[PDB]
């Protein structure tokens, strides 16, 4: 074939295997109906009367709003990178991927930041934030966020592709731009307050043994199983487009067969940083006792 | 449409909830301790280290301390008991000299169970002050342990004899999946009670904030 | 209770005078305070209004953007700060006391006042200026309003006051029929929207002087042109 | 000897106990048989007050029907304006456990009380547009359970200690106790008429008494555990007592004995709170189950349910003009009911 | 204790000497008073919104 193509005007070139329309709709089928199961419920029934309640709740807005739209992605990809529906639609349907993962990811930073100020600062002013605080900072965090990503809405993605139609923030381009960027962030940043507060916290907790361990030790285990859940959803797809930017600078895309691998490789792990909003309702919720 | 005296009126009852928020966030950022113990239990001193209702106040690393102690209220405990459900903790004093002068310590020791399974204070911790040990020491010396407990085994020591108690009195909870007990031995003249409770109010208060965000 | 207003004096067209009213014997935070204003020779004429908390100022059009009214409840003192004096503000200002909820009395206490000498609303009708009556008999004073008092609650918003000769304005009534603490049974108020009365029974010395009605309906309040009682 | 009285006693308590029976010719259900039910009674809430930030503990309503004065143990007492929701006064007080509250049937005065063992009268109406705490009414050596007024002048208490009192209010002094019982005294009805009083104790007992004489009138038993209510009937001829059996009972005084017997199966908590309605033919009665239930006072049935609590229903009352019920809880709320 | 048994006696004999009358009579009693006092009772007889001061 013949995969070079022009996007934006930037060089880029983009693969179309069968395999993706073969393996990620088996995985993003039970992504979805896991999400809607879970998250629906987490949104009928909050997890609205304390701040970590509202907090729980707008992560939970944000995951149900990434699962709605993943049915669109699974028939972009059951037709081979085929869009059958046009071009502002599937501007707002990247939009709303991006806003949402970005959404979910600061959310769970800004619970893992209460718990760290809950137990190693119990006297701290922070753990006594009314509900009005809550919601205007939540609000604010929403706002940041869109901010953030309306430049989707902005940019044109909608590209001809031969025969077909290809929508996507994800084209193998010469082209390192505020997405990408943004895209290592919401990882590598998130990932380091996350950890340091959780181990801030499980020091703390271990300096204390006043014979309560039976449930020390489950926090701690909740804890941990929130950091490895985070860790192992989106590491992935990052360190593939780490390899993509290496190969980029250093073999510009002429030759570009040599991407083709990766490519498949990034897709398929994309799949993970979707399947993080079906197990944050069984890590973060279902694990109170209700 | 209101009136230009009702709308004045609805100022001043947005003042007076202004006023009354404040007062609430003031109030929650207070511990609350109910002291409880038995007659010439030694709680005296712990009032000193740290005709109704009697209401100290004390600070201690910038935490403010609410005492109330009930003692002097001889009625029937079960009608004003449930007015102090969600104090923070309860402090209970036991003097140790009490075990071979008139089964003072069965009658403590009752009052303990009373308490400590009450229906009100399921989720309440206790900080178990033992009184008196310098006189438990030279009466242990000169009298046995088993007047108070006749099926007591061991040395006739002040560290078994202590460790006895400590322990009979803590089996006395039901509860040892909810609650906890944090018993420290006293005596008249002392200067780490203070950091006990200190201490045992900050395990609380991190164990109720940990319950709040769900991690239990 | 104490109401005590300084500032007054001479003043040439143009300038500008800070007025003051210390406060003492109430809790001077709780209570909403007014600016009122008699010329040498004429009735009451209502100026400034600051409630308590400082968060509603009101001004009556002839003074507003010229006038403007302040508060310091720690130093329990009220302050107007009046600028581009005209001769129309040649007047004795006193600042008067009100509170406001249910069962209230507002306009209750009136300060002593001092003087200032410079070199769509509801009109309140006091028909009668003057009535000549002996003590021992019956006296009836009428006011009208251009549209009714009575609002929707139940409440018709109308004030007498006394102010007797030498002396600040008095309460007698509120709210059309509830007597002010202090005052004698003698005196009675009744009526319907736009038509009160105030009955004075028993006539007695010290009851003469000038009555006024005032409403509170709406701002800015407005009084009547005072019947005049003398013996 | 103390084996002679003690056979007195059994023997008046005998005698007693024969005279009741002679009296019980009919059941107050046999005759209430004939009359047509209340109905379904659907009463709906119109308003919810939301200051306290506590448990409320206690509530009392003005003779006016439009203000309402409540106490909860963050201190704070509120007289709240019902028609608009307005706070009209907030109080606070020198000691947050308070237990009981009063309105002065002249809108003048306001009495609160509980474990500090006093009484508090604090002035509404003042030149210097504050309240005030006019009188500190001290003498009880146990907690204060209930205060009603008689007039601004005359005040009756009921404490931990087995003892009623009544207190002048200028003097600061009780002129007449009342010291029959055995057990606390939680509740306190005076009679429409000011000259009986009826209280119940933790004893399973209550007493009718005289407040001029000073003297136990009558006593009446039939509960199994301690009274936490007590109201009048409207005409003052009877009452109806709340107990922890989750019971409430209905008295006759001139028959001198119990007339009715409220309660149901599936209730099996205390009862908290009694009151009735105009005419009396409803009996309010909030119990612990974090509910309200309404009960019909000539046939034992129950008529309604006024459900919207959260937590235990402490109080309640019905205004004079019989037009709405308020209800207050150890959640931070009261509701207003019609 | 001789006292306070004397006390109870005494009582005991103010209780036991008082007129009572037939519950029957008291129960048409209360019966009249509650059919007497049903029209002004709000509670029995929901008020118009127009005329209830909570709406
Ligand atoms: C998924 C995706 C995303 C994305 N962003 N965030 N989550 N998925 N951007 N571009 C594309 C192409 C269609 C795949």
Same mark, same amino acid.
């Given at each position: 074939?013949?995969?070079?193509?022009?996007?934006?005007?930037?060089?880029?070139?983009?693969?179309?295997?069968?395999?993706?329309?073969?393996?990620?709709?088996?995985?993003?089928?039970?992504?979805?109906?896991?999400?809607?199961?879970?998250?629906?419920?987490?949104?009928?029934?909050?997890?609205?009367?304390?701040?970590?309640?509202?907090?729980?709740?707008?992560?939970? %807005?944000?995951?149900?709003?990434?699962?709605?739209?993943?049915?669109?992605?699974?028939?972009?990809?059951?037709?081979?990178?085929?869009?059958?529906?046009?071009?502002?639609?599937?501007?707002?349907?990247?939009?709303?991927?991006?806003?949402?993962?970005?959404?979910?990811?600061?959310?769970?930073?800004?619970?893992?930041?209460?718990?760290?100020?809950?137990?190693? +600062?119990?006297?701290?002013?922070?753990?006594?934030?009314?509900?009005?605080?809550?919601?205007?900072?939540?609000?604010?965090?929403?706002?940041?966020?869109?901010?953030?990503?309306?430049?989707?809405?902005?940019?044109?993605?909608?590209?001809?592709?031969?025969?077909?139609?290809?929508?996507?923030?994800?084209?193998?381009?010469?082209?390192?731009?505020?997405?990408?960027?943004?895209?290592?962030?919401?990882?590598?940043?998130?990932?380091?307050?996350?950890?340091?507060?959780?181990?801030?916290?499980?020091?703390?907790? !271990?300096?204390?043994?006043?014979?309560?361990?039976?449930?020390?030790?489950?926090?701690?285990?909740?804890?941990?199983?929130?950091?490895?859940?985070?860790?192992?959803?989106?590491?992935?797809?990052?360190?593939?487009?780490?390899?993509?930017?290496?190969?980029?600078?250093?073999?510009? %895309?002429?030759?570009?067969?040599?991407?083709?691998? $990766?490519?498949?490789?990034?897709?398929?792990?994309?799949?993970?940083?979707?399947?993080?909003?079906?197990?944050?309702?069984?890590?973060?919720?279902?694990?109170?006792?209700? | 449409?209101?009136?230009?005296?009702?709308?004045? &009126?609805? #100022?001043?009852?947005?003042?007076?909830? !202004?006023?009354?928020?404040?007062?609430?966030?003031?109030?929650?950022?207070?511990?609350?301790?109910?002291?409880?113990?038995?007659?010439?239990?030694? *709680?005296?001193?712990?009032?000193?280290?740290?005709?109704?209702?009697?209401?100290?106040?004390?600070?201690?690393?910038?935490?403010?301390?609410?005492?109330?102690?009930?003692?002097?209220?001889?009625?029937?405990?079960?009608?004003?008991? +449930?007015?102090?459900?969600?104090?923070?903790?309860?402090?209970?004093?036991?003097?140790?000299?009490?075990?071979?002068?008139?089964?003072?310590?069965?009658?403590?020791?009752?009052?303990?169970?009373?308490?400590?399974?009450?229906?009100?204070?399921?989720?309440?911790?206790?900080?178990?002050?033992?009184?008196?040990?310098?006189?438990?020491?030279?009466?242990?010396?000169?009298?046995?342990?088993?007047?108070?407990?006749?099926?007591?085994?061991?040395?006739?020591?002040?560290?078994?004899?202590?460790?006895?108690?400590?322990?009979?009195?803590?089996?006395?909870?039901?509860?040892?999946?909810?609650?906890?007990?944090?018993?420290?031995?006293?005596?008249?003249?002392?200067?780490?009670?203070?950091?006990?409770?200190?201490? &045992?109010?900050?395990?609380?208060?991190?164990?109720?904030? /940990?319950?709040?965000?769900?991690?239990? | 209770?104490?109401? %005590?207003?300084?500032?007054?004096?001479? $003043?040439?067209?143009?300038?500008? !005078?800070?007025?003051?009213?210390?406060?003492?014997?109430?809790?001077?935070?709780?209570?909403?305070?007014?600016?009122?204003?008699? &010329?040498?020779?004429?009735?009451?004429?209502?100026?400034?209004?600051?409630?308590?908390?400082?968060?509603?100022?009101?001004? &009556?059009?002839?003074?507003?953007?010229?006038?403007?009214?302040?508060?310091?409840?720690?130093?329990?003192?009220?302050?107007?700060?009046?600028?581009?004096?005209?001769?129309?503000?040649?007047?004795?200002?006193?600042?008067?006391?009100?509170?406001?909820?249910?069962?209230?009395?507002?306009?209750?206490?009136?300060?002593?006042?001092?003087?200032?000498?410079?070199?769509?609303?509801?009109?309140?009708?006091?028909?009668?200026?003057?009535?000549?009556?002996?003590?021992? #008999?019956?006296?009836?004073?009428?006011?009208?309003?251009?549209?009714?008092?009575?609002?929707?609650?139940?409440?018709?918003?109308?004030?007498?006051?006394?102010?007797?000769?030498?002396?600040?304005?008095?309460?007698?009534?509120?709210?059309?029929?509830?007597?002010?603490?202090?005052?004698?049974?003698?005196?009675?108020?009744?009526?319907?929207?736009?038509?009160?009365?105030?009955?004075?029974?028993?006539?007695?010395?010290?009851?003469?002087?000038?009555?006024?009605?005032?409403?509170? /309906?709406?701002?800015?309040?407005?009084?009547?042109?005072?019947?005049?009682?003398?013996? | 000897?103390?084996?002679?009285?003690?056979?007195?006693?059994?023997?008046?308590?005998?005698?007693?106990?024969?005279?009741?029976?002679?009296?019980?010719?009919?059941?107050?259900?046999?005759?209430?048989?004939?009359?047509?039910?209340?109905? =379904?009674?659907?009463?709906?809430?119109?308003?919810?007050?939301?200051?306290?930030?506590?448990?409320?503990?206690?509530?009392?309503?003005?003779?006016?029907?439009?203000?309402? $004065?409540?106490?909860?143990?963050?201190?704070?007492?509120?007289?709240?304006?019902?028609?608009?929701?307005?706070?009209?006064?907030?109080?606070?007080?020198?000691?947050?456990?308070?237990?009981?509250?009063?309105?002065?049937?002249?809108?003048?005065?306001?009495?609160?009380?509980?474990?500090?063992?006093?009484?508090?009268?604090?002035?509404?109406?003042?030149?210097?547009?504050?309240?005030?705490?006019?009188?500190?009414?001290?003498?009880?050596?146990?907690?204060?359970?209930?205060?009603?007024?008689?007039?601004?002048?005359?005040?009756?208490?009921?404490?931990?200690?087995?003892?009623?009192?009544?207190?002048?209010?200028?003097?600061?002094?009780?002129?007449?106790?009342?010291?029959? +019982?055995?057990?606390?005294?939680?509740? /306190?009805?005076?009679?429409?008429?000011?000259?009986?009083?009826?209280?119940?104790?933790?004893?399973?007992?209550? *007493?009718?008494?005289?407040?001029? #004489?000073?003297?136990?009138?009558?006593?009446?038993?039939?509960?199994?555990?301690?009274?936490?209510?007590?109201?009048?009937?409207?005409?003052?001829?009877?009452?109806?007592?709340?107990?922890?059996?989750?019971?409430? !009972?209905?008295?006759?005084?001139?028959?001198?004995?119990?007339?009715?017997?409220?309660?149901?199966?599936?209730?099996?908590?205390?009862?908290?709170?009694?009151?009735?309605?105009?005419?009396?033919?409803?009996?309010?009665?909030?119990?612990?189950?974090?509910?309200?239930?309404?009960?019909?006072?000539?046939?034992?049935? =129950?008529?309604?349910?006024?459900?919207?609590?959260?937590?235990?229903?402490?109080?309640?009352?019905?205004?004079?003009?019989?037009?709405?019920?308020?209800?207050?809880?150890?959640?931070?709320?009261?509701?207003?009911?019609? | 204790?001789?006292?306070?048994?004397?006390?109870?006696?005494?009582?005991?004999?103010?209780?036991?000497?008082?007129?009572?009358?037939?519950?029957?009579?008291?129960?048409?009693?209360?019966?009249?008073?509650?059919?007497? +006092?049903?029209?002004?009772?709000?509670?029995?007889?929901?008020?118009?919104?127009? #005329?209830?001061?909570?709406?």
């Amino acid at each position: 074939s013949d995969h070079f193509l022009v996007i934006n005007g930037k060089n880029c070139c983009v693969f179309r295997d069968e395999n993706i329309a073969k393996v990620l709709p088996p995985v993003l089928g039970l992504e979805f109906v896991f999400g809607l199961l879970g998250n629906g419920l987490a949104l009928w029934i909050f997890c609205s009367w304390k701040s970590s309640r509202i907090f729980l709740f707008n992560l939970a %807005v944000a995951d149900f709003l990434l699962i709605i739209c993943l049915p669109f992605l699974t028939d972009n990809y059951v037709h081979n990178w085929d869009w059958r529906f046009g071009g502002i639609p599937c501007r707002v349907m990247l939009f709303m991927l991006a806003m949402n993962k970005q959404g979910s990811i600061i959310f769970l930073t800004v619970v893992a930041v209460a718990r760290y100020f809950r137990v190693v +600062h119990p006297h701290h002013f922070l753990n006594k934030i009314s509900n009005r605080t809550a919601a205007i900072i939540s609000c604010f965090l929403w706002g940041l966020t869109i901010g953030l990503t309306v430049h989707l809405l902005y940019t044109n993605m909608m590209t001809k592709n031969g025969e077909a139609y290809l929508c996507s923030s994800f084209s193998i381009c010469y082209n390192f731009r505020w997405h990408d960027a943004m895209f290592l962030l919401e990882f590598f940043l998130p990932l380091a307050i996350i950890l340091f507060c959780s181990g801030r916290i499980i020091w703390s907790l !271990r300096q204390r043994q006043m014979d309560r361990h039976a449930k020390i030790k489950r926090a701690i285990n909740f804890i941990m199983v929130v950091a490895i859940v985070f860790i192992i959803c989106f590491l992935p797809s990052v360190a593939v487009r780490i390899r993509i930017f290496w190969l980029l600078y250093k073999y510009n %895309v002429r030759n570009c067969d040599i991407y083709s691998s $990766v490519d498949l490789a990034f897709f398929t792990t994309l799949s993970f940083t979707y399947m993080n909003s079906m197990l944050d309702p069984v890590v973060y919720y279902f694990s109170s006792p209700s | 449409t209101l009136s230009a005296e009702d709308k004045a &009126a609805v #100022e001043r009852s947005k003042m007076i909830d !202004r006023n009354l928020r404040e007062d609430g966030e003031k109030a929650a950022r207070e511990v609350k301790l109910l002291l409880l113990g038995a007659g010439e239990s030694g *709680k005296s001193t712990i009032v000193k280290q740290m005709t109704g209702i009697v209401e100290t106040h004390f600070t201690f690393k910038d935490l403010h301390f609410k005492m109330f102690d009930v003692g002097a209220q001889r009625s029937e405990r079960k009608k004003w008991i +449930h007015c102090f459900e969600g104090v923070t903790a309860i402090i209970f004093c036991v003097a140790l000299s009490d075990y071979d002068l008139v089964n003072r310590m069965h009658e403590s020791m009752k009052l303990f169970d009373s308490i400590c399974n009450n229906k009100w204070f399921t989720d309440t911790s206790i900080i178990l002050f033992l009184n008196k040990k310098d006189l438990f020491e030279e009466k242990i010396k000169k009298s046995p342990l088993t007047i108070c407990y006749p099926e007591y085994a061991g040395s006739n020591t002040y560290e078994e004899a202590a460790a006895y108690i400590q322990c009979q009195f803590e089996d006395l909870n039901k509860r040892k999946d909810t609650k906890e007990i944090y018993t420290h031995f006293t005596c008249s003249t002392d200067t780490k009670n203070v950091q006990f409770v200190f201490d &045992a109010v900050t395990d609380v208060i991190i164990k109720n904030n /940990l319950k709040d965000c769900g991690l239990f | 209770v104490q109401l %005590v207003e300084s500032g007054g004096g001479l $003043v040439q067209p143009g300038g500008s !005078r800070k007025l003051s009213c210390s406060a003492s014997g109430f809790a001077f935070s709780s209570f909403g305070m007014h600016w009122v204003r008699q &010329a040498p020779e004429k009735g009451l004429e209502w100026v400034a209004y600051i409630s308590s908390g400082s968060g509603t100022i009101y001004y &009556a059009d002839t003074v507003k953007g010229r006038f403007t009214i302040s508060r310091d409840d720690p130093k329990n003192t009220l302050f107007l700060q009046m600028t581009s004096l005209r001769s129309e503000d040649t007047a004795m200002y006193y600042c008067v006391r009100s509170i406001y909820y249910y069962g209230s009395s507002p306009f209750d206490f009136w300060g002593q006042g001092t003087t200032l000498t410079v070199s769509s609303d509801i009109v309140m009708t006091q028909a009668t200026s003057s009535v000549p009556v002996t003590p021992g #008999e019956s006296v009836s004073i009428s006011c009208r309003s251009s549209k009714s008092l009575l609002h929707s609650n139940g409440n018709t918003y109308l004030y007498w006051f006394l102010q007797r000769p030498g002396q600040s304005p008095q309460l007698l009534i509120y709210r059309m029929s509830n007597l002010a603490s202090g005052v004698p049974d003698r005196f009675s108020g009744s009526g319907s929207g736009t038509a009160f009365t105030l009955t004075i029974s028993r006539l007695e010395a010290e009851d003469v002087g000038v009555y006024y009605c005032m409403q509170h /309906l709406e701002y800015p309040l407005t009084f009547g042109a005072g019947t005049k009682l003398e013996l | 000897e103390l084996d002679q009285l003690r056979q007195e006693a059994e023997q008046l308590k005998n005698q007693i106990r024969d005279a009741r029976k002679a009296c019980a010719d009919a059941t107050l259900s046999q005759i209430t048989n004939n009359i047509d039910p209340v109905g =379904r009674i659907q009463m709906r809430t119109r308003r919810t007050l939301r200051g306290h930030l506590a448990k409320i503990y206690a509530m009392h309503w003005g003779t006016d029907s439009r203000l309402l $004065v409540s106490a909860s143990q963050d201190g704070k007492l509120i007289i709240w304006d019902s028609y608009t929701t307005n706070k009209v006064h907030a109080i606070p007080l020198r000691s947050s456990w308070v237990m009981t509250c009063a309105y002065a049937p002249s809108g003048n005065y306001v009495a609160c009380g509980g474990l500090d063992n006093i009484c508090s009268i604090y002035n509404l109406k003042t030149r210097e547009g504050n309240v005030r705490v006019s009188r500190e009414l001290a003498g009880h050596t146990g907690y204060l359970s209930c205060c009603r007024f008689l007039d601004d002048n005359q005040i009756v208490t009921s404490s931990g200690d087995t003892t009623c009192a009544l207190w002048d209010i200028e003097t600061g002094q009780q002129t007449t106790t009342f010291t029959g +019982h055995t057990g606390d005294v939680m509740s /306190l009805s005076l009679a429409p008429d000011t000259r009986l009083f009826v209280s119940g104790a933790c004893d399973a007992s209550a *007493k009718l008494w005289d407040v001029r #004489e000073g003297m136990c009138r009558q006593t009446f038993t039939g509960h199994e555990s301690d009274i936490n209510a007590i109201c009048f009937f409207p005409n003052g001829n009877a009452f109806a007592t709340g107990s922890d059996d989750a019971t409430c !009972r209905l008295f006759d005084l001139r028959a001198d004995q119990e007339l009715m017997t409220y309660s149901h199966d599936n209730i099996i908590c205390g009862i908290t709170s009694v009151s009735f309605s105009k005419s009396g033919r409803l009996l309010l009665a909030g119990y612990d189950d974090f509910n309200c239930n309404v009960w019909d006072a000539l046939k034992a049935d =129950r008529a309604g349910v006024l459900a919207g609590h959260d937590n235990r229903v402490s109080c309640l009352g019905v205004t004079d003009d019989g037009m709405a019920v308020a209800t207050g809880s150890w959640d931070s709320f009261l509701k207003i009911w019609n | 204790s001789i006292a306070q048994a004397r006390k109870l006696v005494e009582q005991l004999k103010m209780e036991a000497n008082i007129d009572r009358i037939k519950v029957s009579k008291a129960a048409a009693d209360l019966m009249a008073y509650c059919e007497a +006092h049903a029209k002004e009772d709000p509670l029995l007889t929901p008020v118009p919104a127009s #005329e209830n001061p909570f709406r």
